Amino acid sequence: AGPPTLDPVNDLQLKDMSVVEGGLRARKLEELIQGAQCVHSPRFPAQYLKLRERMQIQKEMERLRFLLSDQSLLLLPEYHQRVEVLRTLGYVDEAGTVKLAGRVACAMSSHELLLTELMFDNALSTLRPEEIAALLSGLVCQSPGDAGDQLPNTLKQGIERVRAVAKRIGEVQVACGLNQTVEEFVGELNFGLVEVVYEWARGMPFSELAGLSGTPEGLVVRCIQRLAEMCRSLRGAARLVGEPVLGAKMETAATLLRRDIVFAASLYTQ
Amino acid sequence: VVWEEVLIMLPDHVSIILLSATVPNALEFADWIGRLKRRQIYVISTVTRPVPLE
Amino acid sequence: RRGLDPTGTVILLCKGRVPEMADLHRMMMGKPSQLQSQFRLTYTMILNLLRVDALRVEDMMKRSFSEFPSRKDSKAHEQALAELTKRLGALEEPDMTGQLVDLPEYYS
Amino acid sequence: KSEIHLFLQRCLARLRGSDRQLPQVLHMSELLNRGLGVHHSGILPILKEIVEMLF
Amino acid sequence: MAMEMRLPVARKPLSERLGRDTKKHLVVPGDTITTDTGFMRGHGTYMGEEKLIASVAGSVERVNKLICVKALKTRYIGEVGDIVVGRITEVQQKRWKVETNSRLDSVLLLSSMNLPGGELRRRSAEDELAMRGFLQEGDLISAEVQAVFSDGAVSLHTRSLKYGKLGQGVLVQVSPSLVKRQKTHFHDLPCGASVILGNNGFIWIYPTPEHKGGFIANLEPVSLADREVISRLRNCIISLVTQRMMLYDTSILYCYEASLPHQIKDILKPEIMEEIVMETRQRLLEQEG
Structure with a gap:
């Protein structure tokens, strides 16, 4: 009947719960098989083979349907986890219907999540245009961040009222099925180019601007023309909501930002 | 992802002319393009690059 | 250029230490990397495609290049499914009455 | 060098005087005078295409 | 064919046929809406002197900083x-x-x-x-x-x-x-x-x-x-x-x-x-x- 087989659990000291449990099923199944009825009847093997063949046939067709199925997609669970995070926030309500707050974010360019909550959570809409033209630089400045302690007392407050929104979106980001850390989410935001764009917007000549600023003046103009696009796209949102208190100081900032060195561009323009 | 998203969203009334530089597995990339769109593509490749350099 | 020079030269200048030639051969003499795919998802794509409704996220997902090694034989896949489902109906029902009652449990 | 100084004269002097004299443009046109050039995305685009114009 | 000619009947107000009580907040033009420290005006309201004043009949709908009034008759x-x-x-x-x-x-x-x-x-x-x-x-x-x-x-x-x-x-x-x-x-x-x-x-x-464009x-x-x-x-x-x-x-x-x-x-x-x-x-x- 078979030579004495080594114990998978005790002889080899494999103290795995799965191993012991699988062993117990094997002993129980052998005991139950010893009391089987179908082995005895006239044509057990033929109908057993028929049942086996039928089971393989069912398995083959269900495998073929699963191959040609939508659940076979790789990142579909990630898409669902990226939709539930878009639904916990009041953007999408139920099964493909978009709210009003979910229609403001569509007509933007970058940082839709962090910018719509800033428009709603009032932290910037009660400031002068020449300052909010400086805070919005922290999104797209793309430089190492070291601020200055000589800045006004409101800026040392103005910087953490957006990092709080970052530490309000990160928790729902992480605990929704996504694999992006909250800390590296706040690490995207840096404030290297925050003071320079301030004196730049107040209307002071660039000659000493480049001298005092500790950065080459080649990325400043690109950061400027990136900022002016989001300021041109926030007007459509302020118009959609119907709140011209911010849409007026933003229009003043937009007209206060357009200089002539920016438009110089190339040699044979005209 | 920019190129893939454009290529999928591009309609079927345009004849694209891809210009790579000796990409190895180019015999199935144009197969995929010719199958996504109901269009027929042709593949050209050369050897013996001129002005030899060491 | 297209013949507009005698020759050309590409000098490698190592200034700190030996350049570990064994990886030099992996780069100079070696076929280029295969054209892989880096399809990924972002909030911008979904937000833009949710407002207007002419496509779906599953359609751009499946019609991408990452699913190419899987969807190259789809038509054959449902054709084989149809043939195999037709082959399902040709099998008579195995006997389940009498002393063959325990047959499915025995098979399991 | 006369050709360089005349092409540069018709290139740079198309804008305001305050922008005409800046440390980046003098520190680049000086090395351009000797026949050198530095090209990267961290310089002004008008100074970016000048180098490839001369090259 | 008889060209039936009935007579007008007085309308029954208050919708007593089913019976419901509204839990919403209803306003009319001139009413002073909540006037807390910082709020943003929506469509249907305006601002006076330190006051958020409703400008159209309807019900207020707020999503987390926004007071607005939704009228029941407007144009598209x-x-x-x-x-x-x-x-x-x-x-x-x-x-x-x-x-x-x-x-x-x-x-x-x-x-x-x-x-x-x-x-x-x-x-x-x-x-x-x-x-x-x-x-x-x-x-x-x-x-x-x-x-x-x-x-x-x-x-x-x-x-x-x-x-x-x-x-x-x-x-x-x-x-x-x-x-x-x-x-x-x-x-x-x-x-x-x-x-x-x-x-x-x-x-x-x-x-x-x-x-299966004009x-x-x-x-x-x-x-x-x-x-x-x-x-x-x-x-x-x-x-x-x-x-x-x-x-x-x-x-x-x-x-x-x-x-x-x-x-x-x-x-x-x-x-x-x-x-x-x-x-x-x-x-x-x-x-x-």
Whole structure:
């Protein structure tokens, strides 16, 4: 009947719960098989083979349907986890219907999540245009961040009222099925180019601007023309909501930002 | 992802002319393009690059 | 250029230490990397495609290049499914009455 | 060098005087005078295409 | 034929027939809304002296910093990616003018139009002469809004296959606040006809396009069994739209099924409408609930 087989659990000291449990099923199944009825009847093997063949046939067709199925997609669970995070926030309500707050974010360019909550959570809409033209630089400045302690007392407050929104979106980001850390989410935001764009917007000549600023003046103009696009796209949102208190100081900032060195561009323009 | 998203969203009334530089597995990339769109593509490749350099 | 020079030269200048030639051969003499795919998802794509409704996220997902090694034989896949489902109906029902009652449990 | 100084004269002097004299443009046109050039995305685009114009 | 002549009946106010108490917050112009430290004004309100003053009758709806008042009667306001239906009222040199129940007119640019042919043949100034030939005065289109202008004007485009000039059918105009926002405003109801629920208040009912841009005329007689269905849906749409009901696919299907027992000609009475609206209300109550 078979030579004495080594114990998978005790002889080899494999103290795995799965191993012991699988062993117990094997002993129980052998005991139950010893009391089987179908082995005895006239044509057990033929109908057993028929049942086996039928089971393989069912398995083959269900495998073929699963191959040609939508659940076979790789990142579909990630898409669902990226939709539930878009639904916990009041953007999408139920099964493909978009709210009003979910229609403001569509007509933007970058940082839709962090910018719509800033428009709603009032932290910037009660400031002068020449300052909010400086805070919005922290999104797209793309430089190492070291601020200055000589800045006004409101800026040392103005910087953490957006990092709080970052530490309000990160928790729902992480605990929704996504694999992006909250800390590296706040690490995207840096404030290297925050003071320079301030004196730049107040209307002071660039000659000493480049001298005092500790950065080459080649990325400043690109950061400027990136900022002016989001300021041109926030007007459509302020118009959609119907709140011209911010849409007026933003229009003043937009007209206060357009200089002539920016438009110089190339040699044979005209 | 920019190129893939454009290529999928591009309609079927345009004849694209891809210009790579000796990409190895180019015999199935144009197969995929010719199958996504109901269009027929042709593949050209050369050897013996001129002005030899060491 | 297209013949507009005698020759050309590409000098490698190592200034700190030996350049570990064994990886030099992996780069100079070696076929280029295969054209892989880096399809990924972002909030911008979904937000833009949710407002207007002419496509779906599953359609751009499946019609991408990452699913190419899987969807190259789809038509054959449902054709084989149809043939195999037709082959399902040709099998008579195995006997389940009498002393063959325990047959499915025995098979399991 | 006369050709360089005349092409540069018709290139740079198309804008305001305050922008005409800046440390980046003098520190680049000086090395351009000797026949050198530095090209990267961290310089002004008008100074970016000048180098490839001369090259 | 008897030309029945009934007599007017006084209306019963307060809606006591069912009985409900509202839990909302209702305001009228001049009322002072919450005046806390910092809030943002919506559409329907304005600001005075340290006061948020409502400027239109309705109910306040706030999403987490925003006080606004939603009126119950307005005109259509355009939004990006919104299905609309309109009619040509002016044909200009380089544009048409379309009326879609908005505060202004809507412009259909020649640059955005599926010209006959439906493929890449040409676009030049020769088409400008015949553009005013096919899109004549008083035609029906079905397009999609492109963008919002700087004075509340809307530009709409027809860059698809499902959009373009429409054919035979009937039109029913209602207020542009009874159409429910969805993700599929195109429907193919299993009755014998279709419908487009325009977000601007235009309801278009036409028969199913048999099998399978205005290229086809198809000015041939429509079978008798299709008119009776279109008339049934026309009367049912009037019935549902009138009292309160918000319109979408299931309500119309439910009332259509509820309208079989008695004839299409006899449903114009105040009470037959009531006995159908109440039945649809309770069927929706026993299905959703």
